[PDB]
Amino acid sequence: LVKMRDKILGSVFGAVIGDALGMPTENLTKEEIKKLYGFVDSYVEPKNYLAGKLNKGEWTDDTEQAICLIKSLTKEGIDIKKFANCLIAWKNKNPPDIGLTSLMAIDKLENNDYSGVDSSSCGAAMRIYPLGIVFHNNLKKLKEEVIKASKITHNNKTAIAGALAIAFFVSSALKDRKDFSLLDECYNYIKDIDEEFAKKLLEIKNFNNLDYIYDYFGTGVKTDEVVPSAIATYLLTDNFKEGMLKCINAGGDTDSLASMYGAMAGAYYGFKNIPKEWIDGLKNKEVIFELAERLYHLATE
């Protein structure tokens, strides 16, 4: 009830915060992150390929596409037209960090072509948490809206199977669920979309040290890299802060790893558990707050 609000407020801000904290470390290796910044513990001015292009405390394309999906949502679900049009709106604003996949996909959406490109990049999974929120109870309805909202852009079984695991874990986090049995349940929830991916989530059961986990699955943009190791960070840490430090210092596609971990961790741990320094340091919180209020209303009824 009153907890629901803390969790949702924590999930959204968890996703945006992770996205902004990981922004300066994206496309860098662990060795590089250490040299350029040392141990990242808070927002830092970018020294990667985004230096100059984005100021510290700002969110990237991850949060932008998420804002798109949130504005096209209702109890009835996702309004694909409104969604695609908003993605286009952002795409035509000259994003400094838009991905190749998102570029090609938002291009076909301009030609009223909703078949989407075919890549396993995490583009779909990095913006799925809003669904996991609004439909935390209806796992069948969630699956429908999830495949729907991410098919138009990433028409790839792996890409879709990944977004599902995330939506799955976000809704479970909202039900104060957080244990390894979730791994064998999610597997059944998605295996019918990609057995090879789902079978990869189950491998987390054999690890206990995130460092090895990142070195095993990988932290790049491929969905079968960031999604599994993000879910693994969520399950292998005991508080919100701990997990994020692992994400942002992991190297690779840190911004999406971090964003996805934050969506889950935020949902489970709550807003009040998010280090206040990461909240004050975030830029333009009023836009995120309004979007959080919205998801709360949708989820609340």
Residues making contact with Mg ion (CB under 5 A): 60-61, 97, 255
Nearest Cα neighbor of 228 from 164, 148, 138, 145 is 164
Nearer to Mg ion, 123 or 132 (CB): 123
Nearest Cα neighbor of 298 from 130, 153, 88, 186 is 130
Helix, strand, or coil (residue 152): coil
- Taking the C-alpha atoms of residue 25 and residue 37, their distance in angstroms, rounded to an integer, is 9
Nearer to Mg ion, 116 or 123 (CB): 123
Nearer to Mg ion, 11 or 60 (CB): 60
Nearer to Mg ion, 70 or 182 (CB): 70
| Cβ atoms of 193 and 146 closer than 8 Å | no
Nearer to Mg ion, 65 or 72 (CB): 65
Residue 122 CB, nearest approach to Mg ion (Å):
10
Residue 161 CB, nearest approach to Mg ion (Å):
21
Helix locations, the chain, DSSP H: 2-22, 30-36, 61-71, 80-91, 100-108, 129-134, 139-151, 157-174, 181-190, 195-201, 210-217, 223-236, 240-248, 254-269, 276-280, 285-299
Collect all residues with Cβ–Cβ distance below 8 Å to 106 and sequence separation of at least 6.
Answer: 84, 87, 88, 91, 153
Residue 26 CB, nearest approach to Mg ion (Å):
6
Question: Which tokens go with 43?
Answer: 């927002």
Residue 43 CB, nearest approach to Mg ion (Å):
15
Nearer to Mg ion, 61 or 225 (CB): 61
Nearest residue to Mg ion, using CB? 60
| Cβ atoms of 10 and 289 closer than 8 Å | no
Give just the sign of the alpha carbon dihedral 134, 140, 143, 144. Answer: negative
Nearest Cα neighbor of 151 from 257, 80, 91 is 80
Question: Which tokens go with 214?
Answer: 């990142």
Residue 227 CB, nearest approach to Mg ion (Å):
15
Question: Which tokens go with 93?
Answer: 């604003």
Nearer to Mg ion, 194 or 255 (CB): 255
